[PDB]
Amino acid sequence: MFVKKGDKVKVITGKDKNKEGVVLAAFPKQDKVIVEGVNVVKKHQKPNQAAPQGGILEVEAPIHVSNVMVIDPSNGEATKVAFKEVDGKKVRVSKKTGEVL
Amino acid sequence: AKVCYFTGRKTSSGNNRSHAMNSTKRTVKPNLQKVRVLIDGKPKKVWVSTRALKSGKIERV
RNA sequence: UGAAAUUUUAGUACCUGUGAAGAUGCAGGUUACCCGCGACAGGACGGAAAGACCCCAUGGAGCUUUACUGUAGUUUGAUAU
RNA sequence: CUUCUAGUGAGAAAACAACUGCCCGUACCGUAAACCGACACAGGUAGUCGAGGAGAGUAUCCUAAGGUGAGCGAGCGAACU
RNA sequence: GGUGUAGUGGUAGGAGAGCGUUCUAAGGGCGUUGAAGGUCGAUCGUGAGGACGGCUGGAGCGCUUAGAAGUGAGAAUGCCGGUAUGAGUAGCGAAAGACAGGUGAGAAUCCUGUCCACCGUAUGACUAAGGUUUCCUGGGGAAGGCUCGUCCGCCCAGGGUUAGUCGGGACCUAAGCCGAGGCCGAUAGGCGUAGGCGAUGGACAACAGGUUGAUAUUCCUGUACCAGUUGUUUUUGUUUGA
RNA sequence: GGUAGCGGAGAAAUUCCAAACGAACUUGGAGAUAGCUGGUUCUCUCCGAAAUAGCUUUAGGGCUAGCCUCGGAAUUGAGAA
RNA sequence: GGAGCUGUAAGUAAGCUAUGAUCCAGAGAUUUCCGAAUGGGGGAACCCAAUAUCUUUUAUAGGAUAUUACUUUUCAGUGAAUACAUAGCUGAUUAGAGGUAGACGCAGAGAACUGAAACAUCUUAGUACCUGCAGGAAGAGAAAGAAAAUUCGAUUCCCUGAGUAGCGGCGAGCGAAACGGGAAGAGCCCAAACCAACAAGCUUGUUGGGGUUGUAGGACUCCGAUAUGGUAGUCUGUUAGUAUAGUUGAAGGAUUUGGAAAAUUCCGCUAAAGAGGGUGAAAGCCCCGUAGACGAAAUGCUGACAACACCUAGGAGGAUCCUGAGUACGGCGGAACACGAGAAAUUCCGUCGGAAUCCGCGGGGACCAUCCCGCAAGGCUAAAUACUCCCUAGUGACCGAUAGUGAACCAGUACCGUGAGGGAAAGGUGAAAAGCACCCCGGAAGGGGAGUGAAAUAGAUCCUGAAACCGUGUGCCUACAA
């Protein structure tokens, strides 16, 4: 996937549009990703998971990868990603600035 | 099988044609005869057609 | 606890008559308050089975014989071996 | 398996002690609710044992050992079958 | 287009002109401000049929012109599915159960007890086939059980079959079958000798008791037997040789 | 264990051959053939029969003609009353 | 290739991974047992062996490894009746068995219903089925041909000839070929004469040379050339390309509705990319892609280049020799040719008889003469052609869950049958499980709240939710009516 675990991304579509967060987990097979504090859901858990209250837990659910854009770390803006080989290493580059990653 | 050892003549099928031209399948056989012949220098009894023997070129040991 | 055959829709009487000539349903008349339960089997030409009887189809099948035409076998001759 | 020689033969036999002996089946039903009958089906299912009194008897009636009370019942006590 | 005159029942059937369905092309449109579809309405046309509203629905679909067809159903004892009628009707499949106590949300039906009753050349006890886990233990009551069910040959989870001697194989053969070579034969193959396979038969060494919830001539205790190996000892034979 | 469908087996009944045997069952030829029965789906407009002759292994089938429909040609107008 | 991964498949549990995992492609290792199954047996997936080596035990028992079917080829040894021999037997060696792709090809064997409005000749039809053999194609093929325009010059297949000529209870029906136009194209080897050698018994077999044909050729004899060209050969390399993973690949933000924007509105931008798919509704510019550019360690495939290899002679003479025999052909009986015995050629089978050979032989639809054309009884041969179980990439006025494969789903399954065999049903929550914590009635099931959600009358029998059918409520009517 053009996005990777731990990247800073911007949500471009969905109820959480314009939110930003770090990628907590990636699912290449599903082409989905989890962004902290994004797409939070209330889940009615039984107390069977070492939680002696069950309660209504809050957890981020995955969103489709195409609904996010990687944050240009040097500029802080969302950008599309090109692939340029630098020093013999294939790396991502911000099309808006040319910055790496 | 029942095959002429030298010419390969073998049973085939033919037709019986009555005066009314009714057709029924029949078997037509060659005139094979058991004959003691020298194959590769050793005598053996094999089926041979009278036609093959006719020329006299077939050994009759 | 819980089927089935049947079933065009039916608020599904009687007599005489009529009618594809034997009507619960048509005509005239008569009788009959509404809904059931236990019984009977006259009718619904009641159900079941596209009648086996009968006739027809230039249908089928099994069988018979001095039907027709063939034929396995059996036998006789010529001829080859 | 027992004998006979032919062959084969340098080891044999006895007692004693210790030791070795593989694979497959082994549950359960089996005159049945577990098998053959589409069913937890009044049918069918080879062989063995199969007691006592009266009795020729494994007949018959009632019983022993043993097994079982049958997988819808409670009333009523009409016709009809 | 107007007037006039005439005509306009109809099966087989001929002719003509149309409605609607799906799809293609082009153009022009409509749709989360709600498409198709469904439902209701007192709507329009001469007919097949066409709109427009309300509700439901949640993502595709009309219109015009032309094109192509799996293009229209009410009947075929039509096929498939669903649901009726008969009807809360037939039936609930040979026979004795009663009560007390217990269990449990719930008991004619499950457990325990007592009496009663039934089979007893069997409805008892063993086994072969067949079945193939139905066996035991602990749970369950959805479905199956012709009622009920706390229960079951059901469902769920664990567990259970111990052999030198029993039956079979490492033994033997019958019928029959396979069959090196071989014989015969359009092909395929058919037949068959040697040799094999093949029990329902022949041969063949262990019994008694005990033990588990479930195995027992299999495990355990006791006491055996059969085949063989090693070793100790004892006798006797080593080639006129057991 | 053996005998297998153009067959087997039959103390003989057309009797049995896997719950229908005058010729098993299954698959294929195969969508056998059926002058026979049933069925064949939207609408309106115009017109509208026949159930006869002849021949037919033909008689509830078929062919030509007669009767219906659609288009066309032409006439000294030939039709009807 | 570069960050997650330990399938479906959640859940735990335990782990792996920048020392590069998972994953993708090439190559290789392992690959139990049954199955042609092949050490023997057998009721498939099991049982029991022999030989040799090794292994466990003090030893027997036990375990592992290798070999051990049958037939065919070649060789060697042994070796009967029987003397030599041969047969048998043993060993070694050789290559077959079986399965397919329900297709295509060739061959052996070969129906019936049906049609003829009956039916036997005929038709269905040399079809279905069975069996054998195959190859990627097969079959055919290098004229004893087609013709008679005067000529053509192997075979195959397409168009046409033509529903013609014909065949036919002259019925029903069956039905060509040549010419002409195209696809594709390619021609070559032996036998024989004769020569050399070898071996035995002047010929007679083996070997090599020789030679290959119809305007006759060849031998043989003379001459002259030792070249010139070609190939349908090779796991021979070298080289290129290609197949099997891949890399790169442009351009959008806002505003309105909305749970969500790709929709609406406003301004932009890209295009060798406005194919397509996905993304919370309909996206050229968000993602995967597409246009385009680039890429292979390894292994195949193709093509070139080279190498090796194999073919490749002209002229003149005929004195003599050779040019495919139980053959061609004929009688009888069948069969194939569109041609059903017919006037019937031509081709083939069985049986019997049975030639010529260059002044020769065959054919030109009985047959004869003339003329023309050809040279059988030996072999091989690519391309055009047929088919698709499979693999890759796509297409569709093709289906859209009673349709489309029987099978969109754990389908040739469940189920049925002794067996061959027959053979189903069954797709859709939501954008995302966020799959209803907690409370209440109830033993549970199931409900009512409370929650999630845009929506729960989307609650898993889950999209929509028709009709039959069943029920609740009631505005009007109904107990003298056929």
Ligand SMILES: [K+]
């Ligand atoms: K009538």
Ligand SMILES: [K+]
């Ligand atoms: K009655």
Ligand SMILES: [K+]
């Ligand atoms: K009959």
Ligand SMILES: [K+]
């Ligand atoms: K046991």
Ligand SMILES: [K+]
């Ligand atoms: K007594």
Ligand SMILES: [K+]
């Ligand atoms: K007794």
Ligand SMILES: [K+]
């Ligand atoms: K009971």
Ligand SMILES: [K+]
């Ligand atoms: K009563």
Ligand SMILES: [K+]
């Ligand atoms: K009575």
Ligand SMILES: [K+]
């Ligand atoms: K509406």
Ligand SMILES: [K+]
């Ligand atoms: K119907």
Ligand SMILES: [K+]
């Ligand atoms: K019913």
Ligand SMILES: [K+]
């Ligand atoms: K009912």
Ligand SMILES: [K+]
């Ligand atoms: K229980």
Ligand SMILES: [K+]
């Ligand atoms: K034993």
Ligand SMILES: [K+]
């Ligand atoms: K026995």
